[PDB]
Design a protein around this nucleic acid. Structure first.
Ligand SMILES: [K+]
Ligand SMILES: [Mg+2]
Ligand SMILES: [Mg+2]
Ligand SMILES: [Mg+2]
Ligand SMILES: [Mg+2]
Ligand SMILES: [Mg+2]
Ligand SMILES: [Mg+2]
Ligand SMILES: [Mg+2]
Ligand SMILES: [Mg+2]
Ligand SMILES: [Mg+2]
Lengths: 178, 48, 170, 148
RNA sequence: AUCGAAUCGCCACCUACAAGACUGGAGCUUGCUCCCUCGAAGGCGCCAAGUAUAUUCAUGAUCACAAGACA
RNA sequence: UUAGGGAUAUGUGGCGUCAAAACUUAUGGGCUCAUUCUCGAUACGUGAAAAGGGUUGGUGGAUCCACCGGCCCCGAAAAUGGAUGACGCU
RNA sequence: GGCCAGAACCAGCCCUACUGCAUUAUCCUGUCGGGGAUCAAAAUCCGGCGGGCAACGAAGUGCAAGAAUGGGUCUUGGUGAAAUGAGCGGAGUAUUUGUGCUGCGCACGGCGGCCGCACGCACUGGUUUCUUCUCCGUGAUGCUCCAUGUUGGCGA
């Protein structure tokens, strides 16, 4: 399935005034479901880092960064999350995917599963594609062996939806009820 | 329950697209009573 | 072990989805769940991602490396002649037959019904002759057991006289 | 063109004259016949069959009670001109096997022409057997998925 | 014997068994190769006792429970 | 948030049976095994503390050690036979 | 027949199919270097330099106005007892919407007046290569209500 997060770049600034005729221009990378959420995260970061509020600012650009061609790659994601018991916790993890958005979505699902952390308590610090010889975890490194092969066992194959049945003859493909 | 609409399950119809093919078709429920009463072609075809 | 492994260059067949019943070649392995599949022969099989639950491995494996180029893949497929070999199997013929049956008209279904009935009629003709020579059905097996006991005592003098009188009476 | 004109029609394109149809209701349900024409003023269709093959005579039928298949027979040289609503008109009866000579003659002529056309057409034997065949709904059948 | 009824596939080829981390057969190199019946079809049944230029069908008059049922 | 009735579409809540809806949806990702009040599926609210230990993650330090997270377990004793609503579910 | 059914058409309403404009660069593709691995390779990865449209139904992206004209309404009324219609009638068969190309002046961007203009405003600027139908018509001398089809079944 296609990843549920998209890669946004937001460019913004503070509205000019007499005090600051020529304000600075800031660029921001985010992974959000849509551009409204992307703008919300951008303004939150601006408020908590540069003391600039959305009611006194301008958004000059909000665009989507297109993904590269699909190739099996190793992605390093530097991420952090908050919890009441332990404050802020930062970690660095490695995933295998075909795109940066896919890797980040996988990281979000993994954090939700293994630490019960939700979207709005998570900040993504960095994501990059790294070479095979720089991979440190064996669970990731095992997948770039030159002679990797394995069988498919314990499969559950369901029939095509139009052909599914309820009662079927014992050693026969004949359907009895539907 | 709401008694003026009925739900019918048809053999070999297991998807919503299959059920769309049958929209507008005629449907009949057949039973029997206790006595012989009037019917269509009561006099034209006494065998009915 | 007679089970076909998932590896680079392995031919697979898609199970469900819009690409159902098409074949492709595995060019890379992402993780335990996903692979990359391409096939230069088919027009709807550009390089894309397939979940491993939607794949049935075949018995043919071309010799390519991981993340091979398009030119390398096309040359290997022709040299291996795997598509030609696959097209002659019984399962491949079954798949094409299902496509033909799904698009048939009412007249074509009539033609098939005639052909099946003609075969069944000639099967009964062939079976009947061999059955008379060597008894294998339920009724001919009964006849073989019954004739031997019935004949020895039907030759009685009283039986012959009664049979002659009964036949003459009719 | 005018809705009041006798030539007005809204019949669907599948029910063209010369097509083979499956009867869905009435006395001859399940049989296959040949569509001859449509009566004026957007009236019913007329089918023959013909009678020698399946026993259907020249009859009127509403288009909603047939399935028109994609198999067709060229009936250009049949001259279905005498078939009119007058032949189907019935005399009123007041205060209360059998076939009229005109109806029998019309049936004979039309049937002869139709048999000749079918025999002249290619795959004639297959078409004749197809017309003799009977349609039924078997257990396990899914007519909503078929192409006709 | 009242009784008119609803039901609309049948077989004396399915109607025996076991396993899904191993199903036709071998080979070592243990996931590849070779051989075969090529490893996703119980059999019939749907209008000539069988695929052929044979044969009665109406007026039961445009739908109406199927006016018919020991396949 | 409410005159007497149809059609269409939603809200809260749901789609294994009871019971309408995934005839047990996907060609989505992870985690979990619970032996007599019998794990869990309890918004309001209608059970659980200090303190401790099977699997799966993360920070530091060596050449294997401390630290702290998820799910599970112990800590956890009452009076008629009984309650995630029932069956059941891995 | 003021009863029961089927089909056809008309007005309204409801739900379908058929879709163009902007954008893409942290991207696409060659070549050189190092880097990795192998049995030797390639590949994942990092610099430079030269070209660019990832255009198959490109893209999970920002808008969308596509009915000149597919089915349902035992969920509404009717069969022309006023049909106002791009739909009925009459007459023409040419107008003028957009696309493409392009003129002058202004506007816009860059440099410090010249250079650029993706095609903005005015001249309803030019061209007709593609694309499209256009123009007229019926008051109530009807204050209000009711009254009009087709095919079978039942009713002699
Ligand atoms: K190189
Ligand atoms: Mg008539
Ligand atoms: Mg009956
Ligand atoms: Mg239900
Ligand atoms: Mg632990
Ligand atoms: Mg319980
Ligand atoms: Mg409990
Ligand atoms: Mg409950
Ligand atoms: Mg380069
Ligand atoms: Mg007009």
């Amino acid at each position: 399935v296609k990843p549920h997060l998209r890669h946004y770049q937001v460019v913004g600034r503070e509205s000019p005034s007499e005090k600051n005729p020529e304000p600075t221009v800031y660029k921001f990378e985010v992974f959000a479901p849509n551009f409204v959420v992307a703008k919300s995260r951008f303004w939150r970061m601006m408020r908590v880092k540069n003391k600039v509020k959305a009611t006194h600012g301008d958004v000059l650009s909000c665009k989507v960064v297109k993904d590269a061609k699909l190739v099996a790659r190793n992605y390093l994601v530097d991420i952090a999350y908050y919890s009441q018991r332990c404050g802020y916790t930062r970690m660095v993890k490695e995933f295998r995917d075909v795109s940066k958005t896919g890797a980040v979505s996988q990281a979000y699902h993994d954090l939700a599963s293994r630490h019960r952390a939700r979207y709005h308590n998570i900040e993504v610090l960095n994501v990059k594609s790294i070479p095979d010889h720089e991979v440190k975890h064996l669970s990731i490194a095992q997948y770039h062996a030159p002679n990797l092969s394995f069988p498919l066992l314990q499969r559950r194959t369901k029939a095509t939806r139009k052909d599914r049945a309820i009662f079927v003859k014992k050693n026969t493909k004949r359907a009895v009820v539907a | 329950q709401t008694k003026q609409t009925a739900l019918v399950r048809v053999e070999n119809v297991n998807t919503r697209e299959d059920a769309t093919w049958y929209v507008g078709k005629r449907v009949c429920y057949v039973y029997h009573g206790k006595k012989v009463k009037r019917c269509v072609r009561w006099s034209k075809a006494p065998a009915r | 072990v007679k089970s076909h492994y998932i590896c680079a260059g392995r031919l697979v067949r898609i199970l469900r989805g819009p690409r159902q019943d098409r074949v492709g070649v595995i060019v890379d392995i992402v993780d335990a769940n996903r692979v990359l599949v391409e096939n230069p022969e088919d027009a709807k099989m550009w390089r894309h991602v397939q979940n491993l639950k939607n794949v049935e491995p075949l018995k043919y494996c071309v010799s390519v490396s991981r993340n091979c180029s398009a030119k390398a893949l096309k040359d290997a497929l022709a040299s291996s002649k795997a598509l030609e070999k696959y097209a002659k199997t019984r399962t491949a013929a079954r798949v094409e037959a299902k496509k033909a049956c799904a698009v048939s008209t009412d007249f074509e279904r009539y033609q098939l019904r005639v052909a099946r009935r003609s075969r069944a009629h000639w099967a009964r003709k062939v079976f009947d002759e061999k059955d008379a020579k060597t008894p294998v059905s339920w009724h001919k097996v009964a006849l073989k057991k019954m004739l031997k006991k019935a004949a020895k005592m039907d030759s009685t003098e009283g039986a012959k006289r009664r049979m002659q009188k009964a036949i003459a009476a009719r | 063109v005018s809705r009041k004109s006798p030539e007005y029609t809204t019949l669907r394109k599948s029910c063209a004259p010369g097509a083979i149809a499956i009867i869905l209701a009435g006395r001859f349900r399940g049989r296959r016949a040949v569509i001859l024409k449509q009566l004026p003023h957007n009236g019913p269709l007329v089918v023959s069959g013909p009678m020698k093959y399946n026993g259907v005579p020249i009859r009127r039928i509403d288009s909603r009670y047939v399935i028109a298949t994609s198999t067709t027979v060229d009936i250009s040289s049949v001259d279905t001109a005498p078939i009119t609503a007058e032949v189907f008109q019935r005399p009123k009866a007041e205060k209360p096997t059998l076939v009229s000579d005109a109806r029998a003659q019309l049936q004979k002529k039309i049937d002869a022409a139709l048999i000749a056309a079918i025999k002249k057409d290619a795959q004639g034997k297959e078409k004749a057997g197809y017309l003799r065949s009977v349609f039924t709904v078997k257990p396990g059948d899914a007519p909503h998925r078929w192409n006709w």
